[PDB]
Design an enzyme around this catalytic site. Structure first.
Site, PDB file in Angstrom:
ATOM      1  CG  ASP A  61       2.909  16.691 -16.405  1.00 52.50           C
ATOM      2  OD1 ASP A  61       4.388  17.240 -16.834  1.00 52.50           O
ATOM      3  OD2 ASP A  61       2.259  16.816 -17.586  1.00 52.50           O
ATOM      4  CB  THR A  68       6.883  15.180 -21.454  1.00 56.02           C
ATOM      5  OG1 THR A  68       6.513  15.677 -20.043  1.00 56.02           O
ATOM      6  CG2 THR A  68       7.098  13.549 -21.067  1.00 56.02           C
TER       7      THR A  68
HETATM    8 ZN    ZN Z   1       3.560  18.035 -18.865  1.00 53.49          ZN
END
Ligand code: ZN
Ligand SMILES: *[C@@H]1O[C@H](CO)[C@@H](O[C@@H]2O[C@H](CO)[C@@H](O[C@@H]3O[C@H](CO[C@H]4O[C@H](CO)[C@@H](O)[C@H](O[C@H]5O[C@H](CO)[C@@H](O)[C@H](O)[C@@H]5O[C@H]5O[C@H](CO)[C@@H](O)[C@H](O)[C@@H]5O)[C@@H]4O)[C@@H](O)[C@H](O[C@H]4O[C@H](CO)[C@@H](O)[C@H](O)[C@@H]4O[C@H]4O[C@H](CO)[C@@H](O)[C@H](O)[C@@H]4O)[C@@H]3O)[C@H](O)[C@H]2NC(C)=O)[C@H](O)[C@H]1NC(C)=O
Ligand code: XEX
Ligand code: BR
Ligand code: CA
Ligand code: CL
Ligand code: NA
Ligand code: NA
Length: 807
Positions: A262, A160
């Site tokens: 996510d 990320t």
């Molecule tokens: Zn992640």
């Protein structure tokens, strides 16, 4: 720190200038810092009556308690619920309207430029655009009506923080310094983690992100970060409120960020049935934003970018490899675990720690082993993952769908998760999304996949900003834009070549080379001269000579079958160019010529390699850039054994090289209808991705000044329309390239004891590269003379041939 929370957020809610301690804060990030004023929730995070107008609220008496408003004054206040005009004024939702090209910005009075809004989503895998299309109507409308790529490639590691900050800077993680979600910097002796305070310290964040670029050039920016507990509806309503500020206060660039999909993809896997709802919810947020923009009369004014940081793969507890199953000394290492591995010593005071024995214990030890160990300098150059002190010398590239961990107890005492990411950025599951919509982007246009490092430049173009220096290739994405294109000029050649003729007699050369080449014609005498003067150059040099962009001394050497740019400083070619047609035949190196090396009477003995150095160096052998197997005739074949076509090669590497030259080049010419090949050495002993100067070279052929390359590259070009042969191509080009590491063993290839046909091409695929990667590593500039637009050529130079199947 101490915070004086007794201050107030009255008229300061989501203020753009952040205050320093101990004054209490009211900005986007005050929650992350545990520093908000005592009345932040009450004043800035109102929730009463939710996020949507209902028929009975229309015309309401304003009640300041409400999360958003449906009173007649709300449009002038800039704080209506996003669905206000729909519910209360008979309007349609933006998604329900036909798309209609936006040929020019249609902006309210007082807007100096179309604003840019970046809508970033975490873990939004590229295939969601198709697979979830039914449940994402707003996103589908953006995608179909705007400009979209089938996918966008993230940087490695596909985590990320490295990706979001690459998006903002146009830099590789090795350059901006956010090299993982977790990091140890040994200079600072400090650790960076997703949770906690150390990550707010500015010394971690290198480069210059888009909000600083804009502020420095007089363009105001919304804050890009949002504390996790601020609900998404509130983040949107904040952006919309900002866009109603007076002209002199209003930012021109904004970002929204979502933790989804996510968050759910980790728990349920990329395609778990639980994923449908997070997709629907992100689509609803998009719809809130476009609806809010339509009420502000800004929906045909703003450029919107919908962009993801990385995808998501299926990964479960039971697909974990343990270092404890390989290493005797597992307590003497620290591992950064998971979808990549990074290893360093647990104690700098432990003098028995040895990286060589660790790598060896980790190399090809179990039949189906799901990770490969690398010293960081040997990682594929396309990953650009080495030049930073925060990147540990030993790296593990983990197979997709797997994890690595130190010991089994780490996994159940630190199953649960079904998804993860961080793998090699070529992996299909890690690819993510790009859509650009608005007046400055094209209308109903698909563009080919591209890398996320390129977007910063484009975002700077959208805002009329000069980008800070970055790793994008400015102009390569011009094809995304209707206007604000960036029109660069080709770099200027710095060194002009010499064109030597015959200047030396054979007996001047005492190189210890031998060749069985003595056999005695005015038909063929004129022809040999014409070939040495460049008469075949247009067949073998298809796109102009490469330009040398640094100061050096080099010669152009012409031959019947190939052309080269020979460095008098490095004693070998910088580049060797040749064309192989579909019809070309492969031949052997004749027995009488196995060890033949021939002085080149154009190049002084003092600027030549010598065979005695190779004889004396028991580790090092030599190969040739233009392959003798592909000579056009027995006579022409002699040119291929010139000392000036010779380069140093470890015997283990010559197995790779010989297979590429003997088998693969002809295979590519057959498949692509001829190829043009440019091959050469690369020297990057400091692993910084950039051409080494002569004083940086750490290894020479023993007893000589012949430098040893760290890598060998090839660039293989043909016609995109393969009905035309590579040498008679009227249109766009196609390219694949590689940067093969020049290593003394084949430890990287666990199947190397087998025939080259079982392993060499797999190695080459792993070391696939962009032309631009080769440019940086050699200081050469390719494709100087084509019929194509320069921006098109820039796009070709950023192309990466990935060898993955279809998404
Ligand atoms: Zn992640
Ligand atoms: C991708 O794009 C980027 C951006 O274009 C490319 O990176 C640039 O590459 C240049 C060459 O490597 C480099 O230019 C050097 O800058 C030095 C000044 O550095 C500081 O200032 C800049 C400007 O603001 C700043 O951005 C730098 O930021 C880096 O460092 C801080 C840490 O302090 C980090 O927070 C930040 O993330 C970034 O780190 C990255 O770069 C550094 C190197 O700068 C790496 O070490 C890190 O690992 C990381 O990757 C800095 O704050 C300048 O001093 C250099 O000049 C030296 O060399 C020349 C030779 O030409 C010589 O004449 C000079 O005298 C000097 O040498 C002296 O110092 C030597 C070292 O101590 C010593 O050995 C000598 O004897 C001399 O005393 C040089 O000009 C530029 O900094 C980076 N920029 C960034 C943002 O990374 C990158 O190459 C591209 N990648 C590819 C593959 O194309
Ligand atoms: C739980 N939330 C998180 O882990 C990430 C969250 N990120 C954001 O709010 C915005 O994301 C970033 C952005 C937003 N930019 C928008 C873009 F697409 F250009 C990327 C830029 C640089 C770094 C970013 O995060 C590290 C965030 C929230 C609070 C502090 C930080 Br440091 C980061
Ligand atoms: Br930050
Ligand atoms: Ca270098
Ligand atoms: Cl990490
Ligand atoms: Na040798
Ligand atoms: Na091997």
């Amino acid at each position: 720190p101490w915070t004086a929370t007794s201050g107030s957020c009255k008229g300061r809610c989501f203020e753009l200038q952040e205050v320093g301690p101990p004054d209490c804060r009211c900005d986007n990030l005050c929650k992350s810092y545990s520093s908000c004023c005592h009345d932040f929730d009450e004043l800035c995070l109102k929730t009463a009556r939710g996020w949507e107008c209902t028929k009975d609220r229309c015309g309401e008496v304003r009640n300041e308690e409400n999360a958003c408003h449906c009173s007649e004054d709300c449009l002038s206040r800039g704080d209506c619920c996003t669905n206000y005009q729909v519910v209360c004024k008979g309007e349609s939702h933006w998604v329900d309207d036909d798309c209609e090209e936006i040929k020019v910005p249609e902006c309210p009075a007082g807007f100096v430029r179309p604003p840019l809004i970046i809508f970033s989503v975490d873990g939004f895998r590229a295939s969601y655009m198709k697979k979830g299309s039914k449940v994402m109507p707003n996103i589908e409308k953006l995608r179909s009506c705007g400009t979209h790529a089938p996918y966008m490639r993230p940087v490695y590691p596909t985590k990320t923080f490295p990706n979001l900050y690459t998006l903002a800077t146009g830099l590789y993680p090795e350059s901006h310094g956010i090299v993982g979600n977790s990091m140890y910097d040994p200079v600072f002796d400090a650790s960076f983690h997703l949770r906690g305070r150390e990550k707010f310290n500015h010394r971690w964040w290198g480069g210059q992100p888009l909000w600083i670029t804009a502020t420095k050039q007089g363009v105001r920016a919304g804050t890009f970060f949002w504390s996790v507990s601020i609900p998404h509806e509130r983040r949107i309503l904040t952006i919309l409120q900002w866009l109603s500020l007076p002209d002199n206060e209003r930012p021109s660039v904004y970002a929204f960020y979502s933790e989804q999909p996510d968050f759910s993809g980790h728990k349920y896997g990329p395609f778990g049935p639980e994923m449908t709802n997070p997709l629907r919810e992100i689509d609803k947020t998009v719809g809130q934003l476009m609806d809010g923009l339509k009420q502000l009369r800004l929906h045909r004014c703003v450029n919107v970018i919908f962009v993801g940081d990385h995808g998501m793969e299926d990964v479960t507890c039971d697909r974990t490899e343990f270092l404890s199953n390989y290493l005797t000394n597992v307590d003497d290492i620290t591992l950064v675990p998971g979808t990549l591995g990074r290893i360093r010593a647990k104690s700098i005071n432990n003098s028995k720690y040895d990286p060589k024995t660790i790598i060896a214990a980790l190399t090809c030890k179990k039949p189906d082993q799901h990770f490969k160990p690398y010293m960081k300098q040997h990682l594929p150059k396309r990953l650009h993952y080495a030049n930073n002190r925060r990147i540990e010398d030993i790296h593990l590239l983990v197979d997709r769908r797997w994890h690595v961990a130190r010991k089994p107890l780490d996994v159940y005492k630190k199953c649960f998760f079904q998804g993860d990411h961080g793998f090699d950025n070529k992996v299909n599951s890690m690819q993510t999304v790009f859509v650009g919509y608005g007046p400055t982007f094209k209308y109903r246009t698909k563009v080919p996949p591209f890398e996320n490092i390129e977007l910063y430049n484009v975002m700077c173009d959208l805002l009329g900003l000069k980008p800070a220096p970055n790793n994008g290739t400015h102009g390569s994405l011009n094809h995304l834009l209707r206007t604000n294109t960036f029109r660069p000029t080709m770099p200027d050649e710095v060194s002009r070549p010499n064109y030597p003729g015959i200047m030396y007699l054979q007996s001047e050369f005492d190189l210890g080379c031998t060749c069985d080449d003595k056999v005695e014609n005015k038909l063929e005498e004129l022809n040999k001269r014409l070939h040495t003067k460049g008469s075949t150059k247009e067949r073998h040099l298809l796109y102009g000579r490469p330009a040398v962009l640094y100061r050096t001394s080099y010669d152009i050497l012409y031959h019947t079958d190939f052309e080269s740019g020979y460095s008098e400083i490095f004693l070998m070619p910088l580049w060797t160019s040749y064309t192989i047609s579909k019809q070309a035949e492969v031949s052997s190196i004749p027995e009488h010529l196995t060890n033949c090396v021939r002085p080149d009477v154009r190049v002084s003995p003092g600027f030549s390699q010598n065979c005695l150095a190779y004889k004396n160096d028991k580790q090092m052998s030599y190969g040739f850039l233009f392959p003798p197997y592909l000579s056009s005739s027995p006579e022409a074949k002699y040119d291929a054994f010139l000392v000036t076509n010779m380069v140093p090669m470890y015997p283990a590497f010559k197995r790779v090289w010989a297979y590429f030259q003997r088998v693969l080049v002809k295979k590519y010419a057959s498949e692509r209808n001829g190829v043009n090949v440019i091959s050469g050495p690369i020297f990057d002993y400091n692993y910084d991705g950039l051409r080494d100067t002569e004083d940086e070279i750490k290894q020479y052929v023993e007893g000589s000044s012949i430098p040893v390359p760290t890598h060998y590259y090839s660039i293989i070009t043909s016609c995109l329309d393969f009905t035309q042969p590579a040498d008679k191509c009227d249109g766009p080009l196609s390219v694949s390239s590689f940067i093969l590491p020049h290593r003394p063993d084949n430890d990287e290839s666990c199947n190397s004891s087998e025939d080259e046909s079982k392993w060499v091409e797999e190695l080459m695929k792993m070391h696939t590269a962009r032309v631009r990667d080769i440019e940086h590593l050699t200081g050469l500039d390719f494709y100087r003379k084509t019929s194509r637009s320069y921006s098109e050529i820039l796009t070709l130079k950023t192309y990466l041939h990935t060898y993955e199947s279809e998404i």
